[PDB]
Write an enzyme that holds these catalytic residues in place. Structure first.
Site, PDB file in Angstrom:
ATOM      1  N   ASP A  29     -18.468  17.149 -12.557  1.00 43.21           N
ATOM      2  CA  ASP A  29     -19.178  18.098 -12.448  1.00 43.21           C
ATOM      3  C   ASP A  29     -19.912  18.791 -13.582  1.00 43.21           C
ATOM      4  O   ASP A  29     -19.871  19.910 -14.153  1.00 43.21           O
ATOM      5  CB  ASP A  29     -18.227  19.611 -11.942  1.00 43.21           C
ATOM      6  CG  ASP A  29     -18.864  20.880 -11.765  1.00 43.21           C
ATOM      7  OD1 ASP A  29     -19.992  20.874 -11.371  1.00 43.21           O
ATOM      8  OD2 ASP A  29     -18.095  21.616 -11.975  1.00 43.21           O
ATOM      9  N   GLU A  48     -24.029  28.665 -15.282  1.00 41.76           N
ATOM     10  CA  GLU A  48     -23.199  28.911 -14.078  1.00 41.76           C
ATOM     11  C   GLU A  48     -22.761  30.217 -13.990  1.00 41.76           C
ATOM     12  O   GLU A  48     -23.092  30.985 -12.904  1.00 41.76           O
ATOM     13  CB  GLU A  48     -22.172  27.887 -13.756  1.00 41.76           C
ATOM     14  CG  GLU A  48     -22.545  26.609 -12.952  1.00 41.76           C
ATOM     15  CD  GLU A  48     -23.319  27.049 -11.728  1.00 41.76           C
ATOM     16  OE1 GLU A  48     -22.283  27.815 -10.971  1.00 41.76           O
ATOM     17  OE2 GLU A  48     -24.258  26.641 -11.493  1.00 41.76           O
ATOM     18  N   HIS A  65     -27.869  33.909  -7.013  1.00 38.03           N
ATOM     19  CA  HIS A  65     -27.387  32.737  -7.991  1.00 38.03           C
ATOM     20  C   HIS A  65     -28.349  31.814  -8.133  1.00 38.03           C
ATOM     21  O   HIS A  65     -28.830  31.276  -9.273  1.00 38.03           O
ATOM     22  CB  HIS A  65     -26.078  32.216  -7.408  1.00 38.03           C
ATOM     23  CG  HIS A  65     -25.424  31.123  -8.037  1.00 38.03           C
ATOM     24  ND1 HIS A  65     -24.449  31.094  -8.741  1.00 38.03           N
ATOM     25  CD2 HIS A  65     -25.942  29.801  -8.406  1.00 38.03           C
ATOM     26  CE1 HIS A  65     -23.954  29.963  -9.250  1.00 38.03           C
ATOM     27  NE2 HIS A  65     -25.089  29.200  -9.016  1.00 38.03           N
ATOM     28  N   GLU A  66     -29.140  31.510  -7.123  1.00 39.21           N
ATOM     29  CA  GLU A  66     -30.076  30.320  -7.222  1.00 39.21           C
ATOM     30  C   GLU A  66     -31.385  30.691  -7.897  1.00 39.21           C
ATOM     31  O   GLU A  66     -31.780  29.941  -8.697  1.00 39.21           O
ATOM     32  CB  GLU A  66     -30.663  29.823  -5.733  1.00 39.21           C
ATOM     33  CG  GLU A  66     -29.177  29.336  -4.859  1.00 39.21           C
ATOM     34  CD  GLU A  66     -28.403  28.438  -5.596  1.00 39.21           C
ATOM     35  OE1 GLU A  66     -28.724  27.737  -6.595  1.00 39.21           O
ATOM     36  OE2 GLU A  66     -27.181  28.168  -5.136  1.00 39.21           O
ATOM     37  N   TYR A  86     -27.486  22.149 -18.517  1.00 39.68           N
ATOM     38  CA  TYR A  86     -26.695  22.176 -17.433  1.00 39.68           C
ATOM     39  C   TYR A  86     -25.424  21.027 -17.715  1.00 39.68           C
ATOM     40  O   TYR A  86     -25.161  20.282 -16.913  1.00 39.68           O
ATOM     41  CB  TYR A  86     -27.143  21.942 -16.063  1.00 39.68           C
ATOM     42  CG  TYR A  86     -26.668  22.440 -14.940  1.00 39.68           C
ATOM     43  CD1 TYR A  86     -26.420  23.762 -15.000  1.00 39.68           C
ATOM     44  CD2 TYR A  86     -26.208  21.518 -13.880  1.00 39.68           C
ATOM     45  CE1 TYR A  86     -25.801  24.340 -13.832  1.00 39.68           C
ATOM     46  CE2 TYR A  86     -25.750  22.057 -12.774  1.00 39.68           C
ATOM     47  CZ  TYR A  86     -25.351  23.558 -12.824  1.00 39.68           C
ATOM     48  OH  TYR A  86     -24.703  24.028 -11.708  1.00 39.68           O
TER      49      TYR A  86
HETATM   50  C1  LIG Z   1     -23.448  29.769  -5.179  1.00 43.40           C
HETATM   51  C2  LIG Z   1     -22.900  28.201  -4.361  1.00 43.40           C
HETATM   52  C3  LIG Z   1     -22.775  28.716  -2.891  1.00 43.40           C
HETATM   53  C4  LIG Z   1     -24.003  27.541  -4.619  1.00 43.40           C
HETATM   54  C5  LIG Z   1     -23.987  26.886  -5.984  1.00 43.40           C
HETATM   55  N1  LIG Z   1     -25.142  25.982  -6.169  1.00 43.40           N
HETATM   56  P1  LIG Z   1     -25.769  25.135  -7.758  1.00 43.40           P
HETATM   57  O1  LIG Z   1     -27.262  26.055  -7.907  1.00 43.40           O
HETATM   58  O2  LIG Z   1     -24.918  25.858  -8.746  1.00 43.40           O
HETATM   59  C6  LIG Z   1     -26.086  23.850  -7.480  1.00 43.40           C
HETATM   60  N2  LIG Z   1     -27.077  23.374  -8.566  1.00 43.40           N
HETATM   61  C7  LIG Z   1     -27.175  22.223  -9.350  1.00 43.40           C
HETATM   62  O3  LIG Z   1     -26.397  21.462  -9.302  1.00 43.40           O
HETATM   63  O4  LIG Z   1     -28.274  22.155 -10.221  1.00 43.40           O
HETATM   64  C8  LIG Z   1     -28.726  20.839 -10.948  1.00 43.40           C
HETATM   65  C9  LIG Z   1     -29.967  20.501 -10.697  1.00 43.40           C
HETATM   66  C10 LIG Z   1     -30.947  20.497 -11.715  1.00 43.40           C
HETATM   67  C11 LIG Z   1     -32.440  20.109 -11.588  1.00 43.40           C
HETATM   68  C12 LIG Z   1     -32.716  19.716 -10.195  1.00 43.40           C
HETATM   69  C13 LIG Z   1     -31.910  20.059  -9.162  1.00 43.40           C
HETATM   70  C14 LIG Z   1     -30.491  20.094  -9.235  1.00 43.40           C
HETATM   71  C15 LIG Z   1     -22.611  26.309  -6.257  1.00 43.40           C
HETATM   72  O5  LIG Z   1     -21.937  26.768  -6.862  1.00 43.40           O
HETATM   73  N3  LIG Z   1     -22.779  24.793  -6.142  1.00 43.40           N
HETATM   74  C16 LIG Z   1     -21.288  23.907  -6.276  1.00 43.40           C
HETATM   75  C17 LIG Z   1     -20.741  23.933  -4.706  1.00 43.40           C
HETATM   76  C18 LIG Z   1     -19.526  23.084  -4.726  1.00 43.40           C
HETATM   77  C19 LIG Z   1     -19.937  21.694  -4.819  1.00 43.40           C
HETATM   78  C20 LIG Z   1     -18.289  23.212  -5.539  1.00 43.40           C
HETATM   79  C21 LIG Z   1     -19.238  23.252  -3.209  1.00 43.40           C
HETATM   80 ZN   LIG Z   2     -25.350  27.226  -9.796  1.00 45.27          ZN
END
Ligand SMILES: CC(C)C[C@H](NP(=O)(O)CNC(=O)OCc1ccccc1)C(=O)NCCC(C)(C)C
Ligand SMILES: [Zn+2]
Ligand SMILES: [Ca+2]
Ligand SMILES: [Ca+2]
Ligand SMILES: [Ca+2]
Ligand SMILES: [Ca+2]
EC number: 3.4.24.27
Length: 316
Positions: free
Chosen positions: A226, A166, A142-143, A157
């Site tokens: 969000d 996402e 995912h990352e 985003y």
């Molecule tokens: C696959 C999961 C385990 C992780 C996943 N992490 P994500 O990569 O979507 C979070 N990323 C994010 O917020 O990026 C935004 C960002 C942009 C630029 C620099 C830094 C950050 C997620 O769903 N995060 C949300 C988790 C929550 C808050 C619902 C518990």
């Molecule tokens: Zn993500």
């Protein structure tokens, strides 16, 4: 760093033993030279300053509890690299074998993981909501998929483009989990989410509503939390992707499944050729239809199924 390629052994977050590609020069480093221009894993040491220090180990054995998140971040980055190269002929996230960098032990009790524009970053979790997040192959993929998206479609985003962003990460996270073929499913984050609760997950692609996320456009979140619901409205697209692959009848609309390999081909092509930074859900539908048309022909079952899946989730 400059050195010779070596093979270490360690245990990941879930206690599983695996070999990892390392580099020897005085120390053994989590630096895998076998893939592109390298995969590099760093220790953030509970701080928030990135990347931290390239992971160094005296003996090439990685069995300490402190080592476990590093082992998995490193190993699963390798699997994800292999998926993109072997399945989509894509060389790393930029298509040019960019070095892949990850930091683990980010912050304290940190219940998240992210791509920061330049690298992957994993919290250890607080032991209640998450254990160290690199323990999930779908999470790691995912990352890294955020980096792929940023270099290609560039989906902004927030709001619908962000929900597509996402969903793309959940879809390919899941396809990488299937590629590795160890306990694969259409759930997101189950291996590292809520150690005290069995059988749950952070999101579900097969039934997003199980964890509160919409499975139809008429149920989309329209508020500002969000980033306009990027982790919420992703359920609408995740459900469509699930239906394209597996089939089903959803809100009375029947979809004939075409399998995960074709789902992957269709969405990879949509992502890399048709989507733009501001694409909305309707535009994703059109991109997926065009991609399926390119690959399988306008009169194909594949195209018909893409249309039925988007119909089923209320996206025209
Ligand atoms: C696959 C999961 C385990 C992780 C996943 N992490 P994500 O990569 O979507 C979070 N990323 C994010 O917020 O990026 C935004 C960002 C942009 C630029 C620099 C830094 C950050 C997620 O769903 N995060 C949300 C988790 C929550 C808050 C619902 C518990
Ligand atoms: Zn993500
Ligand atoms: Ca050691
Ligand atoms: Ca699984
Ligand atoms: Ca999963
Ligand atoms: Ca759980």
């Amino acid at each position: 760093i400059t050195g010779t390629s070596t093979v270490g052994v360690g245990r990941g977050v879930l206690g599983d033993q695996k070999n990892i590609n390392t580099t020897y020069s005085t120390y053994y480093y989590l630096q895998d030279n076998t893939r592109g221009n390298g995969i590099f894993t760093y220790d953030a040491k509970y701080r928030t300053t990135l990347p931290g220090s390239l992971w160094a180990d005296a003996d090439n054995q990685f069995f300490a509890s402190y080592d476990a998140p590093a082992v998995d971040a490193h190993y699963y980055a390798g699997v994800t690299y292999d998926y993109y190269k072997n399945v989509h002929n894509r060389l790393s996230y930029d298509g040019n074998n960019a070095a892949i960098r990850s930091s683990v032990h980010y912050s304290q009790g940190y219940n998240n993981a992210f791509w920061n524009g330049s690298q992957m970053v994993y919290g250890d979790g607080d032991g209640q909501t998450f254990i160290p997040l690199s323990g999930g192959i779908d999470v790691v993929a995912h990352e890294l998929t955020h980096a792929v998206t940023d270099y290609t479609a560039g989906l902004i985003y927030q709001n619908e483009s962000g929900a597509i962003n996402e969903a793309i990460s959940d879809i390919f996270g899941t396809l990488v989990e299937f590629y590795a073929n160890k306990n694969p499913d259409w759930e997101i984050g189950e291996d590292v989410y809520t150690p005290g609760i069995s059988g749950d997950s952070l999101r579900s692609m097969s039934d997003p509503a199980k964890y509160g996320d919409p499975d139809h456009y008429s149920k989309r979140y329209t508020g500002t939390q969000d980033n306009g619901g990027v982790h919420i409205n992703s359920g609408i697209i995740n459900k469509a992707a699930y239906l394209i692959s597996q089939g089903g009848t959803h809100y009375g609309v029947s979809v004939v499944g075409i399998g995960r390999d074709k789902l992957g081909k269709i969405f990879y092509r949509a992502l890399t050729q048709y989507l733009t930074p501001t694409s909305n859900f309707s535009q994703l539908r059109a991109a997926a239809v065009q991609s399926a048309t390119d690959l399988y022909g306008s009169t194909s079952q594949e195209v018909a199924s893409v249309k039925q899946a988007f119909d089923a989730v209320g996206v025209k």
